[PDB]
Every structure is written in structure tokens, then in C-alpha cells.
Symmetry: D2
Subunit: 287 residues, 4 copies
């Protein structure tokens, strides 16, 4: 009924960004994707070649309602931030207005004010290297894209939101307890994301009456998951064997939580980490 | 269709039990009230004389679908647990089948298996007495009636519940952080309840595919809350000034979260303490 | 000079009570044993016949400074709490002043005020029964003897303790995370104990300038531990393979931390759960 | 007895680095300071002009034993990392071998292997700006100097340590609960430090048998504390009024904890956050 959500960080339909997009369509929210420049063109190709038709079907006679699809790179806050190499690059040269600020500006100009923000991107150049052999550049690159991205997104997008808006992002338990293969300081990144959620909760709550929470999802065989080193195959088999609920976790599991988290229905919740993981986090010794 | 919920711990319309009842009605769920015999007769007259008429009111013209209302005492697991005095006591003499087991059976015989369970009750003889000054009897009292009852409610009610059912209870932050005024061992009962929710999610999740969670509610001006001597006004005045969301917290705010948690929509959440308190728990220092 | 410590919960030399006793001796602290009457006479013979001779041995030639050894039952707060059967029971008939209050007074009359208190005891009638299958009696039993005793030990022992004294107890991670095998409501008692340590730090810190903390010990092969049916071998084999510190965890490892926490050296620590388990709690997935 | 500790991040004697250095001298550990380049020369001047004589006195006839005092900038891992501006700068031109790697190399060459590491530096260019108006550069600068510094320090210094060595760093509660004035992403930085401690604990434990923990200190009117915006004056008055223990927290309070944390006496502790804050963290509602 004139609800519009922006989802940062889709590349295909095997991630949580898709799951979140499915479920929100059930509540008749219009969807706008933010797609990372280097995969935008291919994503666009697949969409037009119908690769995703099936994944867009919902309930009885309802389709997913994609208002727009835009290039978006969470590396850059303004135009002033893009370096000579990136600008010059084959992926980027063909596109424009993909910075955090340019995307707020562009959405707002095309469609007016929105009321739903989702952060659903992570990126860590050295993810495959354990924390101890992670370099300074790789650590900060991880923090920049995976965590600072959240603050920037909030900082530009509050302007174009209505009061009583909601914002989520996705996190992982590795921030609280040691996950051996989750390297490159994605642990570190997730650590800070959760803490920033509490801090943003305070500022966004008192100064605009906008809520923010994060969802701590169990494992899901996504594009990004397979970039780690298998690891994600072990995480899935372990989860389905030792979690208090022995069923397959689905992107739409997280999706529905996000939708309730994004609705008036959770008015009294903010600054929280909510686990959507079939209860895995509560276990100590595997039985 | 056929979503029946048993709510244990209703005494009036000023409580969280009522907020839950209301919000659950909006979803077209059938409700069954479980009412402590010390207040059961006075609840019935009040109701029959339509004194809750204005509080049964939902949305535009819609009323509350209360299926049945049953005397219920969370102290007694089965008919044999009942001591001679209580069976003979003025307010118990006239009443039948009010133990945890008889209530479970009666619900089954009368209505068949259900799919939702709310634990919404607490008791402590020595609530006015700070923990150090609490006698062994008072402690155990508080533990028995506020913490053990949930365990039992589970034991007897899994029998009459469908797989994929959901169970919630209510807790208070004092379990995690020091709150002067919350005595009797209540903080002890709360800690117990929150840890017991984890262990039960393991059992119920693996053994029956049933979910259990708890809601750490913020302050509400209920009958029970004024029994603390007032502590509650202070705690409300405090939440309304320092929380991120500076807005009155309503029984229905908790209600609608209970609705979510109790529905399929929370499929992948189990064993959790969900905070519904406008974010106060995340604060450290005031301003 | 004049550092006297009362240790509640000693039955043999295979326990944490003994590790604490040993390490405290190295600091030249005077020890007073509090021994459950069901094992008091058998402890005395064993001791007198010098069967603990090799376990009383510290460093190069130094022995254990055991000042006195007293029958003690954490079930009874005062002489009036004692039921006729127990007073008449074979193992209690011969013994005097073994309640929490008489023990406090006797210690004071015999030795004056002390400055250190160890709570090192636990009990649960139904430990073999998983939580869901625990009867109301067993639950309350476990809560009474493992959680309430600490509260009381405080109530009666603050009277005979100097300002700047310190009090510790022992807990187990199962309060925070699900550990199958830990039944009887023990996990409930542990959660209770950890929250009760916070509330008591408030009271004791403001009102008497006395410190209280708890140690979440890792697995140890003690008398009590084999009573769980074995659960303990599994848990040791597990800790030794997956913990960060792959090295046997010894009663004295906990002992020396108890020493630290009990000394002035921990002046600014109160209300905390300190983990001493080679770091196992921080793990999520095995390898 | 041939124990050597390295303390990164002293500038004067009002910080925790001094407190840690005092206490470790009581146990006859030789001390080596790491001093940030821009204050090295002045620090050195004061030392020689005797400004610190009084602050170096310990117990009866013992002085603080400062083995060496070296320039150290946690911004730079190797020689290859220092830029043309810094190299050219007035502070830096007069000094040499101040990178994390060069300091390990230099200590090791002069004095052989050490067994004690302390991390005791924080730095946030935008600390005075709340999280939401913190820029990308300021956020990452905070993370680089305050958190990544820990990993690098461990990464170079393991080489020059003995097995069974210990490492600490200092953190603040703001990582767990909202502290309004603690801006520029020092919250974020502290968040990640605590999470990295658990992760390093795992690698350093399994691969070298070296422990690591962090201490969460209450407020102390230090040089750096006064750089924030007062804020530290409020934090101190609040602490001494509402903490369970109403006494002044001293750098030597933290010091003694560090010393026990750094000794064989805590062999079974790793990967932990330990609160040294007079119990402040346990409170919810101020009484
Ligand atoms: N997949 C899991 O198993 C799992 C478990 C817990 C948490 N999470 C979290 O959920 C989020 C989504 O994960 P996913 O599995 O859906 O991965 P995904 O690959 O499906 O989605 C992440 C997307 O973010 C985009 N992206 C990367 N860098 C970017 C940048 N600099 N600017 C803009 N966009 C960028 C990529 O195009 C990628 O498609 C992640 O942040 C992850 O931390 C995932
Ligand atoms: N009031 C708050 O601010 C607050 C904050 C956090 C959590 N909670 C939780 O909410 C729950 C309900 O509290 P409330 O504030 O709505 O007060 P309430 O009076 O509505 O709830 C207590 C109700 O439980 C019933 N009851 C008491 N003992 C019983 C027994 N032995 N058997 C059956 N029923 C019994 C009484 O009829 C009473 O109506 C409590 O469990 C409390 O832990 C309340
Ligand atoms: N064993 C472990 O692996 C482990 C792990 C974490 C915590 N702990 C804690 O350590 C404590 C001691 O356990 P343990 O493993 O040394 O076994 P233990 O047998 O040494 O300790 C129990 C002792 O308490 C005494 N006791 C029992 N009931 C008593 C009562 N009513 N009054 C007075 N004394 C009584 C018994 O004499 C017995 O010796 C327990 O409280 C437990 O919670 C143990
Ligand atoms: N002071 C408090 O109230 C307080 C409370 C909790 C935690 N802490 C933590 O304790 C630590 C010490 O704090 P403090 O109050 O002693 O401050 P301090 O100023 O006494 O010590 C910090 C020192 O680190 C040095 N430093 C800064 N940037 C550096 C760099 N890039 N490379 C090398 N050295 C650098 C500075 O010279 C400074 O003297 C801090 O990390 C802080 O996060 C402090
Ligand atoms: O299930 C575990 C898991 C899988 C993928 C994740 O996202 C990443 C994005 C980029 C690099 C690394 C991970 C993640 O956060 C957790
Ligand atoms: O706002 C705090 C608060 C108020 C009332 C509560 O219910 C109780 C019912 C009986 C005894 C004690 C508490 C409670 O749990 C928390
Ligand atoms: O290693 C785990 C463990 C083993 C023994 C324990 O002591 C108990 C004493 C009596 C009843 C239950 C437990 C305990 O607390 C934890
Ligand atoms: O007591 C609070 C407090 C004071 C100072 C701190 O260190 C800082 C170092 C550099 C910039 C900002 C803070 C800190 O971490 C916490």
C-alpha cells in the first residue's frame, strides 16, 4: 500500500537478499535491488533471458514486484570517492550514479520517500586466510565493505525515509564464538556490525524514530558462501544434524523474519540481534 | 483455520496476557483463558456483566473470539498434588479440573489438539524482600510458580499439541542485569526461565518439532506490577526517558510479537530471549 | 597474616573444593573444611589414617594448613529448619551445630571473623533425568541445595566477615548453552546461581564492601561427576580435543584462580562469571 | 626471574600502561615501554628530568625496573608501510625502527625472547563525532590503530616469545552497551577487539600454547580520556556513585589483574573478556 524497500547486495537468487525480497512481496511491498557493479550487467542479462521467472512466482496469482534494478557499490559514499583505476575499469565505465549517496538521490528523485532498508552484503578480500595471517589492508577492506557500509547507508538514506521506517542487516554467530574457517576478519566485521546496530539504534531512535535490527542467519549455500575455503558444506551438514530443529534452513525462513522485523508489527523492537538459525546457537556439546 | 491458543495467566485486561489475547484475535486465532482460581469468579462476573466490553474491541467493529475460559492453577501438576486445605478452601471448593494435567485433558476432550501455548504468569511470596533477605520457602515458591510451571505446562501439553506448534513465555531483564526492587528470587526465577527455554528448545525441537521462545518484556502497569509497592512508575518513567524509542510501550506491542513468534512466520527461531522493550536493554549510561 | 577461609563442599581429594584448599595453602591461608554429614565420619577416618597424606603435599616439603574440619549441611539454615527424621537419622544423631547458622557462630566463637568464603557444593535428586522429565520436587531440591545455599551462606556469614572479604562459587557453562546430560534442573540451578551472583554483588558491595564472584569451571572427574552416569569422560575427552588449550585441566588450575579472586589482588572485580576451562566456551564448531 | 614484558602505548604515567607496569614490577618482571613517536621525545625528557621518580617507587626498597624505552607506532607493520609525509615529518625524522616488525626485531636482538605482551593503545581521529556522522576514513583509522594493531602485534611477536607466554589488551563496555559520547567508532573498534581476542585465542592456543585475554576497564582520568567530548568526568562520578563498590578505581586495580592474567597463575584462562570496573557492568536501573 505504498511501501517501498531497498535491498542492497543482490547478485542472483541463491542469497538471503532474494529470500527477503520474496517474502516482502507477499505483503505487497515494492522492491528495488542494489546490485554491485561487476555483476550488474550479467544479472540484468539473466533477468531479461527469464532465468529467474520461476524464482519470482509467489503464492497463487502474485509475482515478485521489482520496481527498479540499479548499480550500487558500497565501497563508495560519494562521487568524490571513486579512484582513477575504478573509473577507468571495464565493469564501471558503462555505468553511473552507483555510490551510496547517488543511489539515495536517484531512488528519492524517481519514487519519493521509502520506508524499508535492508543491508545484505559482505565482502572480505582475504576471507580464506585465518585472522593471524590477515594483513592490514585485507582487514580494513573487510571492515569497510561489510560494516562501515551500514553506517553510510543509514547516513545517506535517513533523508529519503519516512518516520517509523525500519532497517535490517544480516550477521553471523562467528562474531560471538569461534568459527575456524571464517577468516579475513569477517568475524571482526560481523563483531562491529552488531555493536554498531545497538549504537545506530540509539541515534536513529531518538533523532528520527526509525528502528534498526540485525538478523543472525544460519548457513545457506549461496554464491558468497562457496567463496570461503566446502566450509559452507560442512556448516550446513552440521547445522541440520545438531540444531534443535532438524529441517533445511531456507532463505525465506530469514525472509519472513525480515518482513516482520520491517513492519509496524515489531514497533517495540530495536537494536537487537535476532537468531534465525534453527536454534543452533543455543547448543554447547553436540549430542 | 483451527489455530487454538491456550493462555495461562489472565486476571484482568491490564496485563500482558490480555495484549497477547487481543493481537492473536486479529489473526483469527481461537483463544482459551487459563485463570487462577483466587480471581476466577470475580473475572467471570466482570466479563458476563460486559465490563471488558470496550477492551474486547479490535479494529473497526471486530470483537474478541474467546472460545472458553477455564480455572487454572500452575502450582499443581496433577490432581494428586493438591493438598487437603486447598481442595477445601472457599475459592477452590466449587471448581473442577484446574491442575496442569486436567486442564490439558479437558482442552483435548472438549476441542482436540491445539497449536499454540502462552505461559504468562509469575508469583513470589516475598517479592518485596530483597534477595539476600528472602527465606528458603519464598525462593522456592517463586521458582516453583514462575519457572517450574513452564516446564510442566510443556510436559503435559506436548501430548495435546500438533507438530510445528509454538510456545512462548515472558521474562524480565533483571535476570541479566541488576534491578533493585525485583526481589523474592524473581530475578532468580527469570534467569531460570531463560536458561530453561534453551534446554526445552533442544528437547521439544528434536523430539516433537515444537518451538519455544521467551519475550523479555519492558515495564507494564499491570495488577501484579503494583504488588511490588511505586517500583513500576519509576521503571516506566525511566524507560520513557532513556530508551531509544521514546513512546509508551503497550501490552499489544508485546501481543503482536507473541503473535509472530507463535505463527509459522517464525519457523526458524527457537530457544531465544527476544527483547521487546523499545531497546532499553542496549543502553548503559543515561544522558 | 590471619587470612581464614571457610570451604563449603568437601568430600574427598578429587574435587574442586580440594584444588581450592591446596592453592590457598600456598598463600599461607588458614583453611576450615565444611563437610556434608553423609560423608563426614568416613572423611575423618581416612584423614586420621593419613590416606590424604600424598595429596596434602605442596611444593618442596610443605604441608596443608587445615585449621579445623566441621560437619556442615547447606540444606538447613538454622537449627529450627531441621526435621525430626534427619536429627534422628543414623549419620546425623551424633553431630552438633551443622546448620548454616551454627557453623557461622561456631567459626566466630572458635576463631573470630574471617575474610574468605568458598561455596563449592551442588545437589540434585534427579540429575539423571533430563529437564522435561524432572518432577517439581527434584527441581526445587536442586535449586534449594545448589542455588539457595549460596544466598544463605551469605546471609549468615556476612556477620562474621571483615570488610574487603571475598566470596566465590562454582558454576557450569550449561546455564548459558545447552548441554545434554546435565539434568535435574542443575542447568536451572546454575543459571540461578550466576544471576544471583550479580544481585548479591550489588547488596554485599554497597552494604558491606564485600566481593562475590563465580568461576565457571571446565570438566573434572570428581566423585559427584560420575554420579551423572560416562557423561564426564565424554566431556573431558571433548575439552581436551577442541579447546584452545589442549592440556589437562586440574583442580589446582581452578584453585589458583580462586586464590586470586579471593585476594586483595582482585579488588575491582565483582559480580562476574569467570570462565576457567582452557577457553572451550569460546568455541562454536569443532574441527 | 628472567621474565620480560613489552607494553605498547605509554605516553606518561596517568594511563593504564603505567598501572600495569607498576604491578608487574612487584613480581620482578623487567619492563620495556613502546612509545608513540610524536610523544617519545617529550616522554624521554621528563624521565631524565625526574618528573616520574615518585611514580616509579614500589613497596619498601624496590624501584620500577625499566629495561628499555623505544619509539613504536602501531600504524605501521613494516618499513615498507611508512609514507613519504610521515618519513619527512619533524617527529619521525629523528627516530628509527619504530614499526611493529622493527620493534620485535630490535627487542629480540638486544634481549632475547620475552614472555609477556600488553596492548594498551587506542586512537580514533573522529572520537568526538557520533557514529552516524563518522566518516569512512575516520572509522577505519580507528579500527586500524585500535584493533588491527592487536593482530599485527601478535603476528610479529609470537616469533620472539617463549611457549606459555601471555598477552592482554584493554577494552571498554561500550562495545556491548551504548555509551552516548564514545564516538568515532571506538565502540566499533572495541567490538572487534573482543571478538578478535576469542579468535586469536584459538590460533595462539592450538598453534603455540600462548594465551590471550582482554581486560574491560572502568573509567580512568587519563590523557586520552580527556580527548573525548568532561565525558570522562561524568563517567567517573557515575561509576563511583552507582557501582556495587563505591571506591576510586585505580590504574593499579587493573594492573594487578593484568599481572595475574600474565602469570602462570591463570594457565587455564584464555580468550576472555574480564571486567575490572567495580561491578558497574552488572547494573541495569541506577538505584
Ligand atoms: N550465506 C550464508 O550462509 C550466511 C550466514 C550468515 C550470515 N550471512 C550474511 O548475509 C549476507 C548475504 O549473504 P549471501 O550468502 O546472501 O551472499 P550473496 O553473495 O548472495 O549476497 C552478497 C552480495 O553482496 C554484493 N557485494 C559484495 N561486495 C559489495 C560492495 N562492495 N558493494 C555493493 N555490493 C557488494 C555481492 O554482489 C553479493 O552478491 C552477507 O552479508 C553475510 O555476511 C550469510
Ligand atoms: N509487568 C511487567 O512490566 C513485566 C516485565 C517483564 C515480564 N513480565 C512478565 O509478564 C507476566 C505477566 O505479568 P503482568 O504484568 O501481565 O501481570 P498479570 O497480573 O497480568 O500476570 C499475572 C497473572 O498470572 C495469574 N497467576 C498468578 N499465579 C498463578 C498460578 N499459580 N496459576 C495460574 N495463574 C496464576 C494471575 O491471574 C495474574 O493475572 C509475568 O510472568 C512477568 O514475568 C512482566
Ligand atoms: N565437576 C565438574 O566438572 C564441574 C564443572 C563446573 C562446575 N562444577 C562445580 O563444582 C562444585 C563441586 O563439584 P565437584 O566436581 O568438585 O564434586 P564434589 O563431589 O567435589 O563436590 C560436591 C561436594 O559437596 C558436598 N555436598 C553435597 N551436598 C551438600 C550439602 N547439602 N551440604 C554441604 N555439602 C554438600 C559433598 O560432600 C561433595 O563432596 C559443584 O558445585 C559444581 O557445580 C563442577
Ligand atoms: N582511560 C580509560 O578511562 C579507559 C576505560 C576503558 C578502556 N580503556 C582502554 O585502555 C587503553 C589505554 O587507555 P589510557 O586511558 O591509558 O590512554 P593513554 O593515553 O594513557 O594510553 C594510550 C597511549 O597509546 C598511544 N598511541 C596512540 N596511538 C598510537 C599509535 N598509532 N601507535 C602507537 N601508540 C599509540 C598514545 O601515546 C597514548 O599515550 C586504551 O586502549 C583504552 O581503549 C581506557
Ligand atoms: O554461513 C556462513 C557464511 C557464508 C557467507 C557469508 O558472507 C560472506 C561474504 C563475503 C565473504 C565471506 C563471507 C557469511 O558472512 C557467513
Ligand atoms: O516491570 C517489571 C515487572 C512487573 C511485574 C512482573 O510480574 C510479577 C508477577 C508476580 C511477582 C513478581 C513479578 C514482572 O515479572 C516484572
Ligand atoms: O563437568 C560437569 C559437572 C560435573 C559435576 C558437577 O557437580 C554436580 C554435583 C551434584 C549434582 C550435579 C552436578 C557439575 O556441577 C558439573
Ligand atoms: O573511560 C572511557 C574511555 C576513555 C579513553 C579511552 O581510550 C581512547 C583512546 C583514544 C580515543 C578515544 C578513547 C577509552 O577506550 C575509554
Amino acid at each position: 500500500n505504498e511501501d517501498i524497500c531497498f535491498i542492497a547486495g543482490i547478485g542472483d537468487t541463491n542469497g538471503y537478499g532474494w529470500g527477503i525480497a520474496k517474502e516482502l512481496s507477499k505483503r505487497n511491498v515494492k522492491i528495488i535491488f542494489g546490485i554491485w557493479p561487476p555483476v550488474y550487467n550479467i544479472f540484468m542479462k539473466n533477468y531479461k533471458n527469464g532465468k529467474f521467472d520461476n524464482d519470482m512466482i509467489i503464492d497463487k496469482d502474485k509475482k515478485m514486484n521489482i520496481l527498479d534494478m540499479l548499480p550500487f557499490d558500497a565501497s563508495f559514499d560519494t562521487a568524490n570517492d571513486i579512484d582513477e583505476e575504478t573509473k577507468n575499469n571495464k565493469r564501471y565505465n558503462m555505468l553511473q550514479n552507483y555510490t551510496i549517496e547517488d543511489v539515495a538521490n536517484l531512488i528519492h528523485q524517481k519514487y519519493g520517500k521509502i520506508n524499508m532498508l535492508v543491508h545484505s552484503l559482505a565482502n572480505a578480500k582475504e576471507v580464506q586466510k585465518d585472522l593471524l595471517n590477515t594483513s592490514r589492508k585485507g582487514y580494513l577492506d573487510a571492515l569497510s565493505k561489510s560494516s562501515y557500509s551500514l553506517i553510510s547507508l543509514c547516513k545517506y538514506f535517513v533523508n529519503i525515509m519516512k518516520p517509523q521506517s525500519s532497517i535490517i542487516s544480516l550477521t553471523y554467530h562467528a562474531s560471538q564464538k569461534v568459527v575456524p574457517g571464517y577468516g579475513g576478519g569477517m568475524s571482526s566485521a560481523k563483531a562491529a556490525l552488531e555493536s554498531d546496530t545497538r549504537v545506530l539504534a540509539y541515534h536513529l531512535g531518538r533523532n528520527y524514530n526509525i528502528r534498526i535490527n540485525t538478523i543472525s542467519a544460519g548457513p545457506l549455500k549461496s554464491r558468497a558462501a562457496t567463496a570461503i575455503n566446502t566450509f559452507i558444506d560442512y556448516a550446513i551438514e552440521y547445522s541440520e544434524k545438531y540444531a534443535p530443529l532438524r529441517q533445511k534452513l531456507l532463505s525465506t525462513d530469514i525472509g519472513s523474519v525480515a518482513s516482520f522485523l520491517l513492519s509496524r508489527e515489531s514497533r517495540a523492537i530495536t537494536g537487537q540481534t535476532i537468531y534465525v538459525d534453527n536454534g543452533l546457537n543455543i547448543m554447547f556439546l553436540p549430542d
